[PDB]
Amino acid sequence: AKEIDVSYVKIEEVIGAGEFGEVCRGRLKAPGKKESCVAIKTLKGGYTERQRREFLSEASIMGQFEHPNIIRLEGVVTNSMPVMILTEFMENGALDSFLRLNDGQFTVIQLVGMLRGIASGMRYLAEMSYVHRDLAARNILVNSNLVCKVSDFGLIPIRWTAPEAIAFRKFTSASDVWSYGIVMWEVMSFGERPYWDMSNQDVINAIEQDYRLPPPPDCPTSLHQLMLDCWQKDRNARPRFPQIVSALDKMIRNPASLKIVA
Numbered sequence: 001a002k003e004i005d006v007s008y009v010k011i012e013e014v015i016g017a018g019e020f021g022e023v024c025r026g027r028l029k030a031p032g033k034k035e036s037c038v039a040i041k042t043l044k045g046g047y048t049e050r051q052r053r054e055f056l057s058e059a060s061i062m063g064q065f066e067h068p069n070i071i072r073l074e075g076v077v078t079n080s081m082p083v084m085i086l087t088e089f090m091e092n093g094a095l096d097s098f099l100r101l102n103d104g105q106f107t108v109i110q111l112v113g114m115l116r117g118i119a120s121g122m123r124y125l126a127e128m129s130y131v132h133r134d135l136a137a138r139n140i141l142v143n144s145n146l147v148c149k150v151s152d153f154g155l156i157p158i159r160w161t162a163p164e165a166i167a168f169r170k171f172t173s174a175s176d177v178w179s180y181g182i183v184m185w186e187v188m189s190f191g192e193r194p195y196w197d198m199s200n201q202d203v204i205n206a207i208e209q210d211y212r213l214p215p216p217p218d219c220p221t222s223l224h225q226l227m228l229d230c231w232q233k234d235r236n237a238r239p240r241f242p243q244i245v246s247a248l249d250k251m252i253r254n255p256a257s258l259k260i261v262a
């Protein structure tokens, strides 16, 4: 992770609260480059030397990722206090709230483009053996061009989690695929809560009955079928991320196939 001199950083508003400190919007103005907006995670005060380490481990993990659909680490501030992790700032914020605010205002092909971007980011993570464990629309940021970037904001996410990961903590890329299917439903439903206001126990019960979420209004049948593929109880039968990307690319190539609705 690139070390950023704190003199190049300005904090403009606190937008959240993490496990070790704050989340802020700010500005980064490095000597040679233009000034950009950044999101900042902070860690300050009387943290143990361990907590600092645990805090900075996140930046070491993120620094491995370079993909257009994965949030981009700008760098870290570690030679001064507060300790900080900086990423790019995404104009449209989190995907779930973005879609709820803009309910019905995107075409199927636009939504499929978002889903394809998310799937490509996940294919990249799976290829380097990184299991996300909390893939959900709330963890996906949207830029001004509608590009979706997988992120992880930390925290119980029962309703996005594959049954084997709930029961036995077996988290794999295949359980991420289950979560991806939920994200597909969130997107095509313009940010409805998975399983509505069913309790967590109601959700586990429904899945055990072999129930699966229905096609959202106006959702092409082929997209809902791909959701059903992601939600197979047998994790080995779920498509892998490259197969998901290929399936979405076929729909983009053959848009008439997106006209078939329930």
Ligand SMILES: Cc1ccc(C(=O)Nc2cccc(C(F)(F)F)c2)cc1Nc1nc(-c2cccnc2)nc2nn(C)cc12
Binding pocket: 016, 018, 023, 039, 040, 041, 058, 061, 062, 065, 070, 071, 085, 086, 087, 088, 089, 090, 091, 092, 093, 094, 125, 132, 141, 150, 151, 152, 153, 154
């Ligand atoms: C500063 C920061 C630090 C870490 C991450 C983050 O996504 N880390 C992470 C960790 C493990 C795995 C992954 C990945 F795999 F990429 F998903 C990402 C994101 C950010 N950027 C953030 N941006 C934003 C944000 C909000 C509105 C508009 N643009 C950005 N909100 C954030 N909340 N939190 C907790 C972090 C936020």
